[PDB]
Amino acid sequence: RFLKVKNWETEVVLTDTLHLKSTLETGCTEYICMGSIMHPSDVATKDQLFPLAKEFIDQYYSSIKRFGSKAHMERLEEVNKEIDTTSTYQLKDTELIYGAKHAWRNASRCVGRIQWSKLQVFDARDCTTAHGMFNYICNHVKYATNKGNLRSAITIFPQRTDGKHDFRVWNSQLIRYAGYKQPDGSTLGDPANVQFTEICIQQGWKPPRGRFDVLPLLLQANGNDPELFQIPPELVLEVPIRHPKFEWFKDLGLKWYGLPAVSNMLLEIGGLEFSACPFSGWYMGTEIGVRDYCDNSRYNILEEVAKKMNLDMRKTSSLWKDQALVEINIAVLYSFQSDKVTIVDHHSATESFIKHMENEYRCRGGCPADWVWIVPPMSGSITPVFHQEMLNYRLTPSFEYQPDPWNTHVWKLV
Amino acid sequence: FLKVKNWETEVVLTDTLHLKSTLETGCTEYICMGSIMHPSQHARRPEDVATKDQLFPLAKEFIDQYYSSIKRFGSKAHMERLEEVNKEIDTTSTYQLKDTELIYGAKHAWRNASRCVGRIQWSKLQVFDARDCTTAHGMFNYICNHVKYATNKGNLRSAITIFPQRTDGKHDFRVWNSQLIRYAGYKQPDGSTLGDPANVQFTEICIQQGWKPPRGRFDVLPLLLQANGNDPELFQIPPELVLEVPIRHPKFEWFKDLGLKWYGLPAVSNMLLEIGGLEFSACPFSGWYMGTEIGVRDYCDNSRYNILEEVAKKMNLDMRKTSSLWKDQALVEINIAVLYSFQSDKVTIVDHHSATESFIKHMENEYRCRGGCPADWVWIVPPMSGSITPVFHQEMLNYRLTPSFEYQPDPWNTHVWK
Numbered sequence: 088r089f090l091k092v093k094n095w096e097t098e099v100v101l102t103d104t105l106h107l108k109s110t111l112e113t114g115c116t117e118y119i120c121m122g123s124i125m126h127p128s129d130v131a132t133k134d135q136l137f138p139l140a141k142e143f144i145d146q147y148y149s150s151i152k153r154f155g156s157k158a159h160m161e162r163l164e165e166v167n168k169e170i171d172t173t174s175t176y177q178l179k180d181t182e183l184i185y186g187a188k189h190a191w192r193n194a195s196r197c198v199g200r201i202q203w204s205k206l207q208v209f210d211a212r213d214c215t216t217a218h219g220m221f222n223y224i225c226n227h228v229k230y231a232t233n234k235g236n237l238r239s240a241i242t243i244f245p246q247r248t249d250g251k252h253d254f255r256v257w258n259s260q261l262i263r264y265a266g267y268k269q270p271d272g273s274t275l276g277d278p279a280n281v282q283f284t285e286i287c288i289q290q291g292w293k294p295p296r297g298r299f300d301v302l303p304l305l306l307q308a309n310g311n312d313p314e315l316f317q318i319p320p321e322l323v324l325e326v327p328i329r330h331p332k333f334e335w336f337k338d339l340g341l342k343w344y345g346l347p348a349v350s351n352m353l354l355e356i357g358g359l360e361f362s363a364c365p366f367s368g369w370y371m372g373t374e375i376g377v378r379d380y381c382d383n384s385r386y387n388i389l390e391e392v393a394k395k396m397n398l399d400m401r402k403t404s405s406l407w408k409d410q411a412l413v414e415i416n417i418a419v420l421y422s423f424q425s426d427k428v429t430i431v432d433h434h435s436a437t438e439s440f441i442k443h444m445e446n447e448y449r450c451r452g453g454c455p456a457d458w459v460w461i462v463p464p465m466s467g468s469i470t471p472v473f474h475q476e477m478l479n480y481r482l483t484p485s486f487e488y489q490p491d492p493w494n495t496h497v498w499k500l501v
Numbered sequence: 502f503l504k505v506k507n508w509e510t511e512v513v514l515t516d517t518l519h520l521k522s523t524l525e526t527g528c529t530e531y532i533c534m535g536s537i538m539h540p541s542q543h544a545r546r547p548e549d550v551a552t553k554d555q556l557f558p559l560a561k562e563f564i565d566q567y568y569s570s571i572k573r574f575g576s577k578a579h580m581e582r583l584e585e586v587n588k589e590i591d592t593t594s595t596y597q598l599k600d601t602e603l604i605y606g607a608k609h610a611w612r613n614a615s616r617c618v619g620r621i622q623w624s625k626l627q628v629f630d631a632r633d634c635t636t637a638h639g640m641f642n643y644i645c646n647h648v649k650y651a652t653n654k655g656n657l658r659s660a661i662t663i664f665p666q667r668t669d670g671k672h673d674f675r676v677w678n679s680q681l682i683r684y685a686g687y688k689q690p691d692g693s694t695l696g697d698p699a700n701v702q703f704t705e706i707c708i709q710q711g712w713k714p715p716r717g718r719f720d721v722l723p724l725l726l727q728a729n730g731n732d733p734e735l736f737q738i739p740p741e742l743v744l745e746v747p748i749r750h751p752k753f754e755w756f757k758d759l760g761l762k763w764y765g766l767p768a769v770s771n772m773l774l775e776i777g778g779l780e781f782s783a784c785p786f787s788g789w790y791m792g793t794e795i796g797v798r799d800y801c802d803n804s805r806y807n808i809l810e811e812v813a814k815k816m817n818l819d820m821r822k823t824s825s826l827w828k829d830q831a832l833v834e835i836n837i838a839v840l841y842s843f844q845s846d847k848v849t850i851v852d853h854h855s856a857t858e859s860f861i862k863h864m865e866n867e868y869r870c871r872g873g874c875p876a877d878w879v880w881i882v883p884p885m886s887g888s889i890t891p892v893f894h895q896e897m898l899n900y901r902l903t904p905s906f907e908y909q910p911d912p913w914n915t916h917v918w919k
């Protein structure tokens with residue numbers, strides 16, 4: 088079977104055969120579509136792990152034109168011995184790099200995947216303690232940041248064993264700003280991080296209580312209680328936000344960090360689960376300008392910005408929110424570009440994703456993609472992805488969601 | 502039970518209405534086709550003249566639903582209606598809806614349109630019964646009355662006009678226009694396009710049918726009307742029935758000189774209305790615009806009027822790189838001008854902020870009274886400023902309820918001319 092997708096702007100039609108390889112569930116049924124559900128849908132047994140390992144080893148050896156080779160067949164037998172004797176197995180370095188790259192290649196919600204094959208993989212599977220995790224993360228940050236010339240990277244900590252010895256980064260990203268609920272109901276800093284800020288304070292973090300405090304790392308090794316570490320400030324690259332035309336913009340006192348580094352997801356490769364695998368790229372401007380700064384539940388600066396623009400805020404039909412939103416996103420891109428910190432605007436990024444998708448259809452037989460996430464949160468239909476039909480399905484290796492660790496961790500101290 | 506969450510407010514709604522869905526979405530548990538424009542060809546009865554065991558179950562389903570809707574399931578009138586429909590199919594291979602059943606079915610097809618953000622208005626629909634029509638001249642008369650009623654001097658009113666249902670498939674009524682009012686599009690000798698490029702092919706059919714094109718940028722197309730399967734016929738809508746808004750800007754005096762206008766009445770006329778297994782192939786329906794439809798899609802799509810370059814030029818923006826967001830900046834001003842213009846001339850229009858807020862309220866009402874509301878996030882979220890509208894942050898379930906509006910083939914792909 089084949090499935091066709093069409094671009095209604097260009098009338099290009101692409102043919103998807105890759106979906107036949109898909110694995111788990113989308114959440115949809117034959118009679119209900121759950122395409123807009125954010126999160127739809129203890130550890131594996133010996134019998135569950137065998138076919139998962141085989142499928143991955145088979146696809147790795149197919150990718151390197153050695154399917155059926157002597158090395159293919161011996162690797163399969165070796166993997167089987169490990170599962171039989173130890174109930175799990177260990178990836179070779181080559182397979183770990185391949186697995187990490189393809190989890191990114193398969194991330195249907197990521198618009199930046201044209202870069203998937205240029206990913207720096209830091210093998211941190213020898214780590215045993217939170218102090219070790221801190222060291223590996225500092226090196227990751229320093230390498231990825233590269234003085235503003237940002238480089239994609241992932242650091243992979245020991246895989247899950249019995250489920251009782253998980254490695255976890257408790258932060259949702261390596262670098263985020265704290266949030267503080269005030270007695271009067273207002274919020275200082277990032278409202279999204281109020282709860283995680285509370286957890287850090289309880290663990291002994293002494294907060295400066297400002298609007299852009301870089302949070303400490305909260306690191307869990309081997310299922311032990313997590314521990315606090317301050318990222319050395321010289322490794323946190325930040326950009327003060329100014330506007331090329333409104334000289335008053337800098338008086339907003341806005342800044343942001345340069346490195347987007349997701350640290351709460353789970354990396355699954357051949358049935359193995361890497362519960363701590365922080366990865367980073369570089370920003371698309373709308374992540375900051377639209378979501379971080381203008382979500383009502385976030386820094387929520389639209390009112391303040393429109394006021395300084397003297398816009399008429401009496402009625403919605405004046406589109407004052409729309410006008411202010413554009414200017415804010417102009418300033419974000421101008422600021423990063425001026426400080427020579429890597430950033431991509433939504434027009435350039437969506438254009439590259441369409442080229443990526445077409446190449447993937449030609450060379451791989453498809454490209455799973457989540458339209459709801461791929462279309463930027465402003466100016467949707469003037470980007471080419473809006474007009475692009477997409478098919479969403481789950482391939483493995485994959486990045487997955489997992490519960491927040493504080494909802495499952497059982498504490499040990501006193 | 503299935504839950505949807507709003508990530509702005511943390512409201513969670515519980516859906517049980519999906520348990521009444523009838524047609525495939527196109528998705529499976531392994532593949533989601535939520536961004537496919539036409540994902541599924543699952544129809545409720547085969548192409549034309551169904552057998553009795555094919556049509557009667559669909560009719561029984563709808564009459565059952567309608568009589569349930571009015572607290573009369575199993576009543577005398579319900580069981581007589583079942584026997585009546587049973588005899589009509591036995592003797593004519595079809596059946597006829599009562600006027601009340603037609604109105605019920607039309608309102609619920611709108612209520613069930615998962616792609617429509619304007620559905621909070623669904624029960625305020627004026628239904629014009631045109632099932633007595635026999636010729637294209639009569640169709641033109643019915644359509645003129647619809648346009649005049651729905652326009653109402655700028656105070657627009659939602660309406661639908663329903664022509665005779667399909668019988669054997671050779672006697673279809675069709676409006677060949679995709680909307681009652683659209684602008685012509687012309688292929689220029691050099692290679693570009695004048696007017697609306699989306700209507701180049703339809704404009705050619707009209708010209709090839711004897712239409713004398715004024716060959717301008719905003720030439721209201723004629724109506725091409727097909728009655729009882731005969732060849733379609735051209736009619737010019739009296740221009741005094743076609744309300745148009747000239748587009749100007751509340752700040753930019755030069756904006757009026759772009760010479761843009763649009764029409765006030767959006768009237769979809771190429772869709773199919775399906776009620777109880779009956780297929781009404783000509784059912785033009787109209788409401789009032791959301792501003793983004795004109796200012797974002799009609800004006801700023803690359804393959805439509807494509808005016809961003811022009812507007813940005815006049816705005817003196819840096820169009821050297823995409824990162825200056827010169828496209829986004831011009832885009833806002835254009836949509837400001839559209840709202841200001843319609844509102845200045847007292848022609849009904851809604852912005853995307855008010856429309857999306859209304860829809861959230863509609864969703865809440867439907868979950869409260871009906872146990873669900875089918876909605877297509879891909880279509881509901883406006884094509885600009887997505888996440889500063891509340892629908893962007895609203896999870897939605899999509900499923901297909903009947904009665905419904907469906908797509909159908911363009912009639913020039915199927916019509917055997919005489």
Ligand code: HEM
Nearest residue numbers: 191194196197198199202239240366367368369370371486
């Ligand atoms: C190199 C530049 C990159 C760009 C410009 C980019 C862009 C984006 C954007 C805009 C999102 C949406 C984020 C949100 O709205 O929360 C996203 C999501 C995502 N990205 Fe990328 N990305 C990049 C690199 C990477 C890398 C290196 C990886 C992993 C190795 C990755 C994996 C993902 C995943 C898994 C998601 C889904 C996140 C979720 O479900 O919450 N991306 N990306």
Ligand code: HEM
Nearest residue numbers: 611614616617618619622659661786787788789790791906
């Ligand atoms: C009264 C004000 C109304 C508003 C503001 C409104 C708004 C909209 C918008 C913005 C769309 C997307 C259109 C597009 O992108 O092409 C749409 C689609 C749709 N509307 Fe509504 N609408 C209204 C009335 C109605 C009425 C009266 C009906 C039927 C009786 C209806 C049925 C539909 C259907 C079936 C679609 C889907 C069209 C398709 O799939 O191509 N709407 N509406």
Ligand SMILES: CNCc1cc(F)cc(-c2cc(C)cc(N)n2)c1
Nearest residue numbers: 260347348349366367368369370371
């Ligand atoms: C909740 N969604 C996860 C998330 C949150 C976030 F703030 C940023 C990113 C992200 C990640 C990468 C690798 C590049 C990029 N441009 N953005 C992802």
Ligand SMILES: CNCc1cc(F)cc(-c2cc(C)cc(N)n2)c1
Nearest residue numbers: 680767768769786787788789790791
């Ligand atoms: C194939 N696209 C369907 C379409 C095209 C179009 F131009 C306009 C509308 C529409 C219809 C109604 C009743 C209200 C409204 N505001 N818009 C729908």
Ligand SMILES: C[C@H](O)[C@H](O)[C@H]1CNc2nc(N)[nH]c(=O)c2N1
Nearest residue numbers: 123124125459460893894895896
């Ligand atoms: C409800 C909806 O699924 C949710 O708000 C999604 C919409 N699309 C998104 N797209 C991106 N890139 N990031 C997001 O967080 C979301 N949120």
Ligand SMILES: C[C@H](O)[C@H](O)[C@H]1CNc2nc(N)[nH]c(=O)c2N1
Nearest residue numbers: 473474475476536537538879880
């Ligand atoms: C590919 C994609 O599904 C297609 O471009 C859709 C997206 N959402 C839309 N939404 C609306 N309201 N109208 C449209 O025409 C479209 N087009």
Ligand SMILES: [Zn+2]
Nearest residue numbers: 115120528533
């Ligand atoms: Zn789906």
